[PDB]
């Protein structure tokens, strides 16, 4: 759909769309940029993630509102709440499938540097996690395992190739710990991962510049916030 627009123009317009809080547009511009077939830079990977994370984040929040109403309804309100929750759920699944399709065709296979490959595998884990949040049928276990497998591959690369304060490594561990707690029914694994990640980052802060320290400590605080909620 964006096939006739220049890559550089799509990137520029994604940045404008973020400033205007037009995240659906942002995501469409970044989908068009990925489909040009070239690898993405660090900055461009962040534009792609910001765009889709915000779109699906809004869908998730709406699905949760509707699912809560539906559960309370289960006086007969008729089929409308279930129908509308199903409509939002199908849209959410469609966006997740789109993101997963971009990662599979062909972002992951072309990503050789640890920073890019971990970034994309963390995204893959996240979008299977979002699918798992709404899954109920025969594929629910397989969707959960697909998230797990992507996060695990990202973890294995991150532990070999990045320092324990690297912000991508930290964000990956944060999100995988959320997976363990909220999806996999493994709260002890979630707590252990968050604690070990936090403590190993703390011990490496002394190596960092002021700007790297700020980024690592920001994500450490998120780990700590979850640990406070979970313990």
């Amino acid at each position: 759909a964006m096939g006739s627009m220049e890559r550089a123009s799509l990137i520029q317009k994604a940045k404008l769309a973020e400033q205007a809080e037009r995240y659906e547009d942002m995501a469409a511009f970044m989908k068009g940029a990925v489909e040009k077939g070239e690898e993405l830079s660090c900055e461009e990977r962040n534009l792609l993630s910001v765009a889709y994370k915000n779109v699906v984040g809004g869908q998730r929040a709406a699905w949760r509102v509707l699912s809560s109403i539906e559960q309370k309804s289960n006086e007969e309100k008729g089929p409308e709440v279930r129908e509308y929750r199903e409509k939002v759920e199908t849209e959410l699944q469609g966006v997740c499938d789109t993101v997963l399709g971009l990662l599979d065709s062909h972002l992951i296979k072309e990503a050789g540097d640890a920073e890019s490959r971990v970034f994309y595998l963390k995204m893959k884990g996240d979008y299977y996690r979002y699918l798992a949040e709404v899954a109920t049928g025969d594929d629910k276990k397989r969707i959960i395992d697909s998230a797990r497998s992507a996060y695990q591959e990202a973890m294995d690369i991150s532990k070999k190739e990045m320092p324990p304060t690297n912000p991508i490594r930290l964000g990956l561990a944060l999100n995988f710990s959320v997976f363990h707690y909220e999806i996999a029914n493994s709260p002890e694994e979630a707590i252990s991962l968050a604690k070990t990640t936090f403590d190993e980052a703390m011990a490496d802060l002394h190596t960092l510049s002021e700007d790297s320290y700020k980024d690592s400590t920001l994500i450490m605080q998120l780990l700590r916030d979850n640990l406070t909620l979970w313990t």
């Binding site: 944060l174 959320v178 920001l218 998120l222």
Partner: peptide, 9 residues
């Protein structure tokens, strides 16, 4: 609980 945000803010 909380996952990583898209931007630092």
């Amino acid at each position: 609980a909380g996952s990583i945000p898209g931007r630092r803010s």
